[PDB]
Amino acid sequence: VAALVIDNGSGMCKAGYAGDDAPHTVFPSVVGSFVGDEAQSKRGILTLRYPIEHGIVTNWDDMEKIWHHTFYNELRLAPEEHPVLLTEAPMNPKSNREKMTQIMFETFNVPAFYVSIQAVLSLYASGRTTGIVLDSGDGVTHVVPIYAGFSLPHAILRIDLAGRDLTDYLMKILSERGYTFSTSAEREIVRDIKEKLCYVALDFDQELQTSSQSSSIEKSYELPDGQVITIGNERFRAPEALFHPSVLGLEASGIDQTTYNSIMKCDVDVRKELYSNIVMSGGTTMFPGIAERMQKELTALAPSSMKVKISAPPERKYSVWIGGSILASLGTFQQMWISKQEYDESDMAEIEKFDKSKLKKTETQEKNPLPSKETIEQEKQA
Ligand SMILES: Nc1ncnc2c1ncn2[C@@H]1O[C@H](COP(=O)(O)OP(=O)(O)OP(=O)(O)O)[C@@H](O)[C@H]1O
Ligand SMILES: [Ca+2]
């Protein structure tokens, strides 16, 4: 039956069917045996490992289980009856791209297989073949400039500053305020707090000065045990670490300066195209206000001559996935699959034209439950 699209991330696995407009199932990319959402909910009695760190696979035994979980537990199909399209981080080592192929063909017996660079799919999802993509997930952030469907590898930038860091940071400035967030389970509550209440300030110092004597800044959050806590300027302080990573002790450049530094590694003739085709994807780019701040920061850095236009669609959390769904539905793409045999032995205009409104409506099942107070306490005893 239909082709499958699996986007494996550092924190989250996104799976579904080519032609649908959204992943079928999204679940944490974790093993404790139990995988993902079921491991999540039993983390009280379990030790959890994340097989993908910074977007590169580090444990193929664990990686295999997640795919097993995707096929048989989540999507509930025979993997031998469905071509699979996978995604990979840029600069993924050939050893890994080979191992990925091996397991797909030899372990799960897929009829066809293909693997794509994530940022590229996000560009496709946005209906472009030339642009610069800012792809920030849980474990890694990438800046990937792309021209006529090909990445310019010399100018691909990577910072190890992403959602993981922002979570740990938020947890760190919340601990300073007196909240006892000390376990891995409580860390997930802080992730949720981040996703719900955090935002990026247009002007950080102005807003910071205003926060000190305002009550508008304050928001309430209910913990699992039922205690309500109140979040103040931590709301915009934690995401500020994307733009000034020094507050994390990282001597990295912010996501604004790294985007600029990337473009400037490109030919002058090309830059004008990149600047007016900036695409943001990934979950970390979901903060309210991040696009307007990106717009402002880049404008103030760019030549006055070039206009800055940034694409940040509502669904950009699952852009990479949507890119795969569109890609795998293209007529000219069918000629590109790797066949089970082919392994035993060894277009540009369609993207622009593709009508996303014809992709089938899909309700994403996000399975990533938050821990009970029992589980938090279970973990406390360690
Ligand atoms: N609305 C939101 N606001 C802020 N952060 C969010 C939001 N939604 C998700 N996140 C964060 O985004 C991250 C997950 O994003 P995403 O699924 O794009 O990355 P991934 O593919 O799992 O990881 P990677 O790209 O590192 O492999 C998590 O850190 C999560 O807490
Ligand atoms: Ca990702």
UniProtKB/Swiss-Prot annotation:
Gene3D superfamilies: 3.30.420.40, Actin, Chain A, domain 4. Its EC number is 3.6.4.-. One of its GO terms (molecular function) is ATP binding. One of its GO terms (cellular component) is cytoplasm. It is found in: Cytoplasm, Cytoskeleton. It is an enzyme of class 3 (hydrolase). Disulfide bonds: none annotated. Actins are highly conserved proteins that are involved in various types of cell motility and are ubiquitously expressed in all eukaryotic cells. Belongs to the actin family. This is Actin. It comes from Komagataella phaffii (strain GS115 / ATCC 20864). The gene is ACT1.
